[PDB]
Amino acid sequence: FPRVKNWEVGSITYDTLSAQAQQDGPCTPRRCLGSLVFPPEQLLSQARDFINQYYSSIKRSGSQAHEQRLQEVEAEVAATGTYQLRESELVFGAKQAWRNAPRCVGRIQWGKLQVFDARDCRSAQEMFTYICNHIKYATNRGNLRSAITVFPQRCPGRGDFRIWNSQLVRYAGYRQQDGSVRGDPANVEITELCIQHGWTPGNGRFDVLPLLLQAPDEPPELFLLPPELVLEVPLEHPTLEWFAALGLRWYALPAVSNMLLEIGGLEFPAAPFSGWYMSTEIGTRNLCDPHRYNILEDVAVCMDLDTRTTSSLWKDKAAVEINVAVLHSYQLAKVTIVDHHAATASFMKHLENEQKARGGCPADWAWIVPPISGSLTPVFHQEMVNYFLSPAFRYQPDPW
Amino acid sequence: FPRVKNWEVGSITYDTLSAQAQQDGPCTPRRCLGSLVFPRAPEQLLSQARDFINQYYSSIKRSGSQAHEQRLQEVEAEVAATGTYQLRESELVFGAKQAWRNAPRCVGRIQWGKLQVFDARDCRSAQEMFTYICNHIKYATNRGNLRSAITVFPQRCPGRGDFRIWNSQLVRYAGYRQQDGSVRGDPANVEITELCIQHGWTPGNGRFDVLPLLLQAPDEPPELFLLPPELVLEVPLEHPTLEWFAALGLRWYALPAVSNMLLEIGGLEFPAAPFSGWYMSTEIGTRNLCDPHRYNILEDVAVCMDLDTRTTSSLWKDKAAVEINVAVLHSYQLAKVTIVDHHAATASFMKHLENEQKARGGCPADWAWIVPPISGSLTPVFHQEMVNYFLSPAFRYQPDPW
Ligand code: HEM
Ligand code: HEM
Ligand SMILES: C[C@H](O)[C@H](O)[C@H]1CNc2nc(N)[nH]c(=O)c2N1
Ligand SMILES: C[C@H](O)[C@H](O)[C@H]1CNc2nc(N)[nH]c(=O)c2N1
Ligand SMILES: CNCC#Cc1cc(C)cc(N)n1
Ligand SMILES: CNCC#Cc1cc(C)cc(N)n1
Ligand SMILES: [Cl-]
Ligand SMILES: [Cl-]
Ligand SMILES: [Gd]
Ligand SMILES: [Gd]
Ligand SMILES: [Zn+2]
């Protein structure tokens, strides 16, 4: 069992939970690949295993309904080639997928998740109304609440439910008279899929893209989001009066709409989940990545920093203030947000809870460590073990 | 072969060099352990030696020549007769350079060709060992214009014990346990400090007392050796605009010289081969001064900066650490002591990966060690996927000799 040390304190644990791993990862004894981003009847074995998880979690191994529920899935597959999850199981499976996500630093919250069941969804027009319920529920006038909406489980020989945008809220990416991009360059492609399918393109750096929702074996359909429902936060700095004039904004709800939820062998290619932001996601990655909004130099000129030499650490000063402006703005607007120090400190608490309950925790070091001030947070000093448990959120190819 | 993406540009390469990794690391297909600090007969000596010699004769563009099979047969016959063999001097120099080249946790490998190799394999005692080490420090420091060097002491051989430098670096500050429970000085060095005192060193009681060296000759107890103060170049720390910063009384030394690692070349083992370069400012500013278990000055600096420390979202920790780094850089520049900031170092590491892709089809790299401990995604290495693996020649960790 892997020895795991915390170098701040000196304490040692052993990950016994690693023993239960399922889908082999990308690493071999020859070379480590942990820094890479995107590295019939067998349906029964994963179903048995998930049901066993459910019942031991509610202290129900060696019991009647446990014995009993094993047969129904047995019978359901035999008769139909698949099965339906009991509503409580879909609830328990969604939380466990969240809990097992190695790249999520906010899993201290995993037990509080609202599960919208859209398994009887029927059309793209129906998807949109579920999506719109979710958003308004999750947003909650800025007091954000974790939530996932679960669309029907994919079935053999018949189409898929899929959301085409990577998130429920994404800003446009327009290409210009010189090839380059006005707006968010992360979404250049889906902006061009949208302009294609009827959308009248704007000219702004912060235009909420229209959704593309896909009924099975039908082409995607454009849906505009009602602007009253897309809560957004204008960015301003508590003491840098000019920062507001840069016209920067970000949206309130982080809602990932391109990952595939897998519970007990069943695959849900449409299952958007949402929480609230950690401030470095907006202030550091989305605003300061060279291939995202790349605002770093503009803020530095405004601060009258010396940008002629790297050793003035003007990049570091400008980045810290951009993060300050994000935190201050969301707090002033009363939108739930958490800083990287509070977030990582809560995750160290999660790791400890998980050690007592399950004997370990799959964590991906490069993703848990924040992208500014790494070693100032306690996770930097924490050794971690990465591996795959089910149920899980998985990546999936693009439906085109 | 593993596909490697740069997420800032879109570039894509394939690490073919990884195929040739002829030792195992800690990960399996079940689980990745890449974030752990310390994961870990003539036939095998021969095949390591054979492979290194092939490397050497490739580097001199004489692969498959008279000299080449000459040396191979020669090395086997020397193993057959003696159970080991000796490196020629130019083989030693190529072997130390490749070891630096192959080191996955080193961000400064752009410089890997520029290395001064001191051959101390004739060294015969701890006293001579000390004289060689003083000469290393003198040459490498070069009055502040630092030069990369390594001194190689006699290899491990059967029948005799190893030379060892008990100290983890040639320059280290003492760490004394206080009246209460606190450490005065550097808490990373409580153990080596206790060993020196137990071996008769007379301790000080400052926060920056340079430690003596504990030098072990084969089959010999370690011997204490004081470093002449004018040999250890130090830098008082001041901040260019925060004039109260100088009153903290903080110092760091110029020369980073790791002295406890094992150099392995062609199957042969050199347990004493100290190497030195020059510092990247985050090692001092962020890690050494701001780690909670090191000097731990962050809160004190932030209170002095009049930052609001009662709440994390004011980002006082981040603000105060950026200024401690500014101070480190400005102080070394003022003092005319070589130093590189994490923006310049990561930028030149990106050229190294480029040069190495062309030369060898890859480059072993430990992402979590290459990405600096502040401003990670502000540097380009954050956005570069990397493949960690073990190539020989190599610097390797070894157990403490006590
Ligand atoms: C409630 C507050 C939450 C916070 C502060 C949080 C924080 C984060 C952060 C910072 C990331 C890194 C994403 C990136 O860098 O692109 C992440 C990833 C992730 N989160 Fe969370 N999260 C929260 C809730 C949730 C919920 C409710 C779910 C699912 C039900 C979830 C599932 C995931 C998954 C699957 C990833 C991996 C994303 C990927 O691989 O691209 N998180 N989280
Ligand atoms: C000349 C400028 C150099 C720079 C800027 C540099 C930079 C660095 C840095 C920042 C680290 C991480 C240290 C830590 O976090 O503890 C490192 C590690 C390392 N470097 Fe370099 N280095 C230089 C020269 C050298 C030389 C001359 C050698 C050997 C010939 C070398 C071999 C290594 C090794 C073996 C490690 C890993 C040590 C460990 O894992 O504890 N470096 N380097
Ligand atoms: C190449 C590297 O693995 C990649 O840029 C990763 C590093 N760590 C990350 N961590 C998080 N949370 N999100 C990311 O997008 C990344 N990017
Ligand atoms: C646990 C974790 O791996 C550990 O704190 C590592 C992280 N990355 C590092 N990177 C460097 N360069 N130096 C270090 O000491 C560490 N420490
Ligand atoms: C490309 N990753 C975007 C993202 C994200 C994300 C998702 C959730 C649920 C919370 C959070 N804080 N962030
Ligand atoms: C715990 N490793 C300490 C270290 C180090 C180091 C070593 C060298 C040669 C250069 C450098 N810049 N840093
Ligand atoms: Cl985002
Ligand atoms: Cl150091
Ligand atoms: Gd001005
Ligand atoms: Gd001043
Ligand atoms: Zn790995």
Is A104 an annotated catalytic residue?
yes
Two tokens at B263? Answer: 């150099």
User: Which residue has tokens 């930028």?
Assistant: B347
Name the structure determination technique: X-ray
- Torsion angle defined by CA atoms of residues A109, A110, A114 and A118, in that order, rounded to the nearest 10 degrees: 150
Instruction: Say if strands A114-117 and A147-150 run parallel, antiparallel, or are unpaired.
Output: parallel
Strand-pair partners of B276: B149, B257
Distance from CA of A116 to the nearest CA of B (A): 32
B284: which DSSP letter? I
Cβ atoms within 10 Å of B28's Cβ, excluding its own: 18
Separation in Å, CA A150 to CA A87, A106, A124, A216? 11, 21, 14, 15
A126: burial class by Cβ within 10 Å (0-12, 13-18, 19+)? middle
> Which candidate, A279, A277, A297, A276, places its Cα nearest to that of A288?
A297
Is A314 an annotated catalytic residue?
no
Q: Is the distance from CB of B395 to CB of B261 less than 8 angstroms?
A: yes
Q: Could you say which residues from 293 to 322 on chain A have a Cβ atom under 8 Å away from some Cβ of chain B? A: 296, 310-313, 315-317, 319-320
User: Which residue has tokens 């080991």?
Assistant: B84
Which residues surround the ion ligand 10 when the cut-off is CB under 5 Å?
Answer: B 241
> Which candidate, B376, B110, B382, B140, places its Cα nearest to that of B257?
B140
Q: What are phi and psi of B294, to 5 degrees?
A: -105, -135
User: Which residue has tokens 């059967």?
Assistant: B158
- Tell if the CB–CB gap between A31 and B2 is shorter than 8 Å: yes
Of the partner residues A34, A37, A315, the one whose CB lies closest to the CB of residue B32: A34
Strand-pair partners of B152: B119
Distance of alpha carbon B262 from alpha carbon B156, whole angstroms? 10
Distance of alpha carbon B343 from alpha carbon B347, whole angstroms? 6
Q: Touching check for A24 and chain B: CB below 8 Å?
A: yes
Q: Show the beta-strand stretches assigned E in A43-122.
A: 114-117
Distance of alpha carbon B161 from alpha carbon A391, whole angstroms? 55
- Tell if the CB–CB gap between B21 and A31 is shorter than 8 Å: yes
Q: Touching check for A28 and chain B: CB below 8 Å?
A: yes
Distance of alpha carbon B151 from alpha carbon B116, whole angstroms? 8
Distance of alpha carbon A78 from alpha carbon A76, whole angstroms? 6
Cβ atoms within 10 Å of B58's Cβ, excluding its own: 12
Q: Is the distance from CB of B144 to CB of B335 less than 8 angstroms?
A: yes
Distance of alpha carbon A35 from alpha carbon B24, whole angstroms? 18
Host H or E run for residue B264: strand B262-265
Check pocket membership of B274 for ligand 6, CB cut-off 6 A: no
- Tell if the CB–CB gap between A339 and B35 is shorter than 8 Å: no
Which strands form A114-117's sheet, in the order they lie side by side?
A114-117, A147-150, A273-274, A255-256
Among protein residues, the one with the nearest Cα to ligand 6's atom 2 is B258
B288 among the known binding-site residues?
Answer: yes
Separation in Å, CA A276 to CA A41, A90, A279, B71, B295? 39, 22, 9, 65, 35
Of the partner residues A37, A311, A345, the one whose CB lies closest to the CB of residue B341: A311
- Tell if the CB–CB gap between B29 and A25 is shorter than 8 Å: yes
Host H or E run for residue B269: strand B268-270
Helix (H, G, I), strand (E, B) or coil at A171: strand
Two tokens at B376? Answer: 């990670």
Distance from CA of B326 to the nearest CA of A (A): 7
b or e along B360-374 (b: 16 or more beta carbons within 10 Å of the residue's beta carbon)?
ebbbbbbbbbbbbbb
Determine the number of helices (DSSP H) and then strands (DSSP E) in chain A: 11, 18
Distance of alpha carbon A390 from alpha carbon A17, whole angstroms? 12
- Tell if the CB–CB gap between A387 and B312 is shorter than 8 Å: no
User: Which residue has tokens 């890690």?
Assistant: B287
User: Which residue has tokens 């100032």?
Assistant: A376
> Which candidate, A364, A287, A274, A264, places its Cα nearest to that of A46?
A264
Residues of B annotated as catalytic (active site), given as ranges: 106, 109, 278, 283
Q: Is the distance from CB of B288 to CB of B297 less than 8 angstroms?
A: no
Distance from CA of B286 to the nearest CA of A (A): 8
Cβ atoms within 10 Å of A375's Cβ, excluding its own: 21
